[PDB]
Amino acid sequence: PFKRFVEIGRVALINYGKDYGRLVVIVDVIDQNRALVDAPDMVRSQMNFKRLSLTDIKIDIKRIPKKKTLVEAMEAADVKTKWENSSWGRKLIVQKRRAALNDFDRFKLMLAKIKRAGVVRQELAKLKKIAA
Amino acid sequence: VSGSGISARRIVVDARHHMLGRLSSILAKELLNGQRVVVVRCEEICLSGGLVRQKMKYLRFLRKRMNTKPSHGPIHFRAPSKILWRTIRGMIPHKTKRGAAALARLKVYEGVPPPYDKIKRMVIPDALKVLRLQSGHKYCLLGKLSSEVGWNHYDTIKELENKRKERAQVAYERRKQLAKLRVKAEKAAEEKLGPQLAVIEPIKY
Amino acid sequence: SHRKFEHPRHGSLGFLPRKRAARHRGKVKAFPKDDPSKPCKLTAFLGYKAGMTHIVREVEKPGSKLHKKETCEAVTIVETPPMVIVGVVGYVKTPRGLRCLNTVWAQHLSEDIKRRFYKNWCKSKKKAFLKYSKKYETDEGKKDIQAQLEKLKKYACVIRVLAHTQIRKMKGLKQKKAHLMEIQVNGGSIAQKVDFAYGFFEKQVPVDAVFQKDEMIDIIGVTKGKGYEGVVTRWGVTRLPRK
Amino acid sequence: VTYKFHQYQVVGRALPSENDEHPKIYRMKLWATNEVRAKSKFWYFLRKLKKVKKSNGQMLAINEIFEKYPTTIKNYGIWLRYQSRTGYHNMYKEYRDTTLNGAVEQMYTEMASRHRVRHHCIQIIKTATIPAKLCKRESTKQFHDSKIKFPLVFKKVRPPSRKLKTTYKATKPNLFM
Amino acid sequence: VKGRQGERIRLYVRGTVLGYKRSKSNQYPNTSLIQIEGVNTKEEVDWYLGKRLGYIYKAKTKKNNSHYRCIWGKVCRPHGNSGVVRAKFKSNLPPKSMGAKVRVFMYPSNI
Amino acid sequence: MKTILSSETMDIPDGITIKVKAKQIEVEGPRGKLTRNFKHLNLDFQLIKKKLKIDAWFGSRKTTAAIRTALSHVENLITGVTKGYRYKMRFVYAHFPINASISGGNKSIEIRNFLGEKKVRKVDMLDGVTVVRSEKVKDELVLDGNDIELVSRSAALINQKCHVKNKDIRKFLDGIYVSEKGRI
RNA sequence: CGCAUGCGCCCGCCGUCCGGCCGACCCGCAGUAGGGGCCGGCCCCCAAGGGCACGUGUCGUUGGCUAAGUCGCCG
RNA sequence: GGCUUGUGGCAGCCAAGCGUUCAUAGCGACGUUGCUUUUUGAUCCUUCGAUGUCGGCUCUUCCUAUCAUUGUGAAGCAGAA
RNA sequence: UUUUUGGUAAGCAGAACUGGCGAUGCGGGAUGAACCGGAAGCCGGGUUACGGUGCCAAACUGCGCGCUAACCUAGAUCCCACAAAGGGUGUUGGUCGAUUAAGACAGCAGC
Ligand SMILES: [K+]
Ligand SMILES: [K+]
Ligand SMILES: [K+]
Ligand SMILES: [K+]
Ligand SMILES: [K+]
Ligand SMILES: [K+]
Ligand SMILES: [K+]
Ligand SMILES: [Mg+2]
Ligand SMILES: [Mg+2]
Ligand SMILES: [Mg+2]
Ligand SMILES: [Mg+2]
Ligand SMILES: [Mg+2]
Ligand SMILES: [Mg+2]
Ligand SMILES: [Mg+2]
Ligand SMILES: [Mg+2]
Ligand SMILES: [Mg+2]
Ligand SMILES: [Mg+2]
Ligand SMILES: [Mg+2]
Ligand SMILES: [Mg+2]
Ligand SMILES: [Mg+2]
Ligand SMILES: [Mg+2]
Ligand SMILES: [Mg+2]
Ligand SMILES: [Mg+2]
Ligand SMILES: [Mg+2]
Ligand SMILES: [Mg+2]
């Protein structure tokens, strides 16, 4: 039993190319290798499945819907909120945030991590002597 | 293939389910760039085409011998580790000093003998069978091929590997329990660390 | 062009090179397969070729021309005085074959065996195994010896005993330096093999404990030497014409 | 945006003469990689079909034809003539693409693969947009399903860019459909 | 805590000397091919263009009370598509340096 | 031409415990338990509830051919643990009677006097297969078991052990042949 | 594994002096037409793209004290 | 020795006919497609400041287009051959 | 290369037009007087030709579609170092015709 299928309404992540990190909706299927995808901020176009990673989100739309119909369907299902709140979608956001930290911000994060590690190690020691 | 370019004292590669030729070409380039490589579990290397074709190829290799003096080569090594070593030798200018030094930086073993049993082992995606061989196509393990051409240590490696895996499972459970004991520690430390967690929150996965 | 007439080649290519053997004592290249269900028993023995004679016996071979008839057949006499066990060695099965783990020797070693460790026994100080023999004299040393034996019981897969001949008992040989070899122990578990070997330390094992009457055995040794030889005698090629 | 093959309408005629001051005007719909090669193939057919060579002909107009709805999916039928190693043959092919330019690109790629036919050994007789109910090839019919549904059996594992490429990794790829 | 003894600050990245600019049948020692750790594309190479390079090695004799020797160079242009770069040094690097490491400094700085 | 979806389904009886995991099917019934390894098939097995569904996605004609093969094998396992399999063999001879000796708890058979030969032919039944001489019929063997492959393969071993050689097999029809392929 | 040279040799220290490192930190197994974690339903995966580490001082200033914690050395 | 393969040698395709009946168990006329360099020719590229020119004897190794031996299929294979 | 005579044919013999080698290195064709590129004072930089970019070995295991599975040493690049007639219910495309919800085909059943 497979968990994800290519179908009309499936939300997919572009895993390769310039559009990497963007969410698109499969609105029609051309052949085995290509699908017709549409997003609120892009023109409807075809792309190969080799550049797509299917997600668990799936909106309820008809084949090749209008942009207004597509936009409201995504908002109704909270596609953006679900993806960003999910662990998979948060990974992409965190990677961008880490790369965007300046020198001063990295120094602050170092101090927080160093202090966090020191306290955690002390807590573990108590859990060792007591809960041997 | 230009090379990994990483700075490491030593690289330990687990060759399980790696394609022989693609693993050889990548490792040959790493060796030529001055990288020291250790390969373990060479008996689990995979060769495309199936056992029958690979067995026939090795039998043709066994035919080659200096008619007037067979001891003068070619030498037909049967063990999986030596077959991998000879495969890499064909991708290196081993008759030059530069090539000879590159080969001297390579170590190959069947199984995982000490001390490498307690050292992190990496994989090479460009040589992995799961990415390079389409499911349903014929392939054979180098250990299986070596046994049929005169390698008699397959059972010995198999028993030692089972013993190592069981010990690794016990060690894995100890770390698994230790991890469960550490999630409690951070929760207890949560009260003390109020400002610190706020800074790490946007960065935590 | 093809050779005019066909005959088999002279000599065997399976006995090459035809060089002088690198040993004087016959080496056992392979020991009998071990059967754990059988009692511990030695697999080999050393002897000395005394000479040949002939015997007469009445054959019992149904369906043979010799049935109930007498036949004269040559026999060889091999003098086999009992051997003395002086040590035990254990091997571990590894991906690179059998590897020697440890060697444990008996407390007392005869002069004849000690001669095997020297090129000039008389001129030497005869220090062999003197320090080794001392640790049998202390409780801590005895514990160490027993610890080594337990180590063999735990890891060893093949057990062989160190045995030497009592060459002094055959004055005709004119030799005092005894011959030492490893004799594999077959039968029983590894623990039984170690206990079997350690129990015979400094004791004698008669030839009857290894072989018996009417059984087939293999004889290993070095053939008679004959020096530099030509192809006709060495390989059996036919002689060329007189002219 | 960018197509390997472009569709052009090429219009030409024989040079006016005293006998014929208004010679017939011929038009063709030709596929080529650019305008220059479209003109060359136009005179090839006029020379061999209407006996009008470029040396005694006149080029009137050349215009590129663009897909009307490049965002929707259409079924395209292509009637073609090609030369094999032993003669000439006619065949009909169907394709699904957003533009007829893509469908023609698929046709050339397929002919090269399944028949070892080079580009210059193919003549396109006719092209058309076939409605779903009038398609003939099963490779096109099976995607005429309102409830089209299937998994991605084969996936290509790779970093989004070569910046995240490393020779060594601590664990093997984790893949599941 | 480790208790290590060594350089306390690292302001350079390591680069591997791959060889010289060459063809299948000719070699040009005046240019060296260097792989910089962490650089995997031609686009990423643009940041390192003009950066100073140092090939540090040990000689048998002592000069200025040290066995260390340094040959200076810089990154000139990218090589290929996989982040390899072409480098020039005050003197052509010896073939012995193949497989050795060089220090890619962060100066001169354009940022 | 890769079909998007090829699927076939079969009905699981009520008194069968079928367990499927990673193309490893285990069937348990009143007669016993049978297990077969289908990891060599690039198919998708699924239990829906009882029915067994096998699907092939974007598979060539060769790949889809294994869908029915997998179902037939599973059906054989179900019949093996419910009804069993019974293969009957008949001795054929013209002059020399064929003497059979069952031994080892019906797990072995020895054939003597085949075409007058003094050689004794010994065949050992495969796991879970028992051979018994029938009494109702003259010169008949009965092989019983749960796995059809083992029972059928055991009969093949007996048949091929008694091949006539250096003779015209058209006239020298001596041998042991399978006469019925049924179930208990 | 045995025995190992008295004006010699082997070890444990202390100094004298001689010929590539820069955090050179990291042990689950197995599968990939799947594998886990929780209550058939819900979650996790979708590359170490991670985690760990005073990671902060002229290879690192002087003089103290030093709770536990981490780390090195030593029977 | 090299190129060539007419000639020599070996092999295949079509099926008129032979085979009591019956194209193809076994054969293959009329045609037609090849292989081989263990025949002989054709050529004159190497060697004429020299590669010792018949056969046998002796000795090793290699080939298969398999004479015998091992395992099998076919028959106008009852058995034997 | 092309036109072309003798010859079964030849890395054979003899002509026609041009180029080439010989007298000439250099890059490619693994290797080669003639093939492909291209002709050259001694150097630095840039860019290419032919040919290439898994390792040997400078440059992608780059981005796309399909075909092939070789239990014959599957196959792998002008000259070029070979293969034919004839066959395959191997597999992939195409062309013509016939049959089929009024019930075909296979099996089953009594046309
Ligand atoms: K001869
Ligand atoms: K003799
Ligand atoms: K003679
Ligand atoms: K510090
Ligand atoms: K011929
Ligand atoms: K001459
Ligand atoms: K075909
Ligand atoms: Mg390279
Ligand atoms: Mg002969
Ligand atoms: Mg041996
Ligand atoms: Mg003598
Ligand atoms: Mg007969
Ligand atoms: Mg002829
Ligand atoms: Mg004929
Ligand atoms: Mg001469
Ligand atoms: Mg001479
Ligand atoms: Mg000579
Ligand atoms: Mg043959
Ligand atoms: Mg007859
Ligand atoms: Mg001439
Ligand atoms: Mg001249
Ligand atoms: Mg060539
Ligand atoms: Mg230049
Ligand atoms: Mg590729
Ligand atoms: Mg053909």
Automatic annotation (TrEMBL), chain A:
Keywords: Ribonucleoprotein, Ribosomal protein. GO terms for molecular function: mRNA binding; RNA binding; structural constituent of ribosome. Belongs to the eukaryotic ribosomal protein eL14 family. Pfam families: Ribosomal_L14e. One of its GO terms (biological process) is ribosomal large subunit biogenesis. One of its GO terms (cellular component) is cytosolic large ribosomal subunit. SUPFAM superfamilies: Translation proteins SH3-like domain. Residues 44-116 form the Large ribosomal subunit protein eL14 domain. This is Large ribosomal subunit protein eL14 domain-containing protein.
UniProtKB/TrEMBL annotation, chain B:
It comes from the Eukaryota. GO terms for biological process: cell wall modification; negative regulation of translation; pectin catabolic process; translation. Keywords: Aspartyl esterase, Hydrolase, Ribonucleoprotein, Ribosomal protein, Secreted. One of its GO terms (molecular function) is pectinesterase activity. It catalyses: [(1->4)-alpha-D-galacturonosyl methyl ester](n) + n H2O = [(1->4)-alpha-D-galacturonosyl](n) + n methanol + n H(+). Its EC number is 3.1.1.11. It is found in: Secreted. It is an enzyme of class 3 (hydrolase). GO terms for cellular component: cytosolic large ribosomal subunit; extracellular region; ribosome. Pathway: Glycan metabolism; pectin degradation; 2-dehydro-3-deoxy-D-gluconate from pectin: step 1/5. Belongs to the pectinesterase family. Belongs to the universal ribosomal protein uL13 family. This is Pectinesterase. It comes from Solanum lycopersicum. The chain holds residues 2 to 206 of 409 of the full protein.
Automatic annotation (TrEMBL), chain C:
It comes from the Eukaryota. One of its GO terms (molecular function) is RNA binding. GO terms for biological process: translation. The keyword Ribosomal protein applies. Residues 17-30 have a biased composition (Basic residues). Residues 1-35 are annotated as: Disordered. Keywords: Metal-binding, Ribonucleoprotein, Ribosomal protein. Mg(2+) 1 binds at residue 6. This is Ribosomal protein L3. The chain holds residues 2 to 244 of 389 of the full protein.
UniProtKB/TrEMBL annotation, chain E:
Belongs to the eukaryotic ribosomal protein eL33 family. SUPFAM superfamilies: Translation proteins. One of its GO terms (cellular component) is cytosolic large ribosomal subunit. The keyword Ribosomal protein applies. The keyword Ribonucleoprotein applies. This is 60S ribosomal protein L35a. Keywords: Ribonucleoprotein, Ribosomal protein. InterPro entries: Ribosomal_eL33, Ribosomal_eL33_CS, Ribosomal_eL33_sf, Transl_B-barrel_sf. GO terms for molecular function: mRNA binding; structural constituent of ribosome. One of its GO terms (biological process) is ribosomal large subunit biogenesis. It comes from Solanum lycopersicum (Tomato).
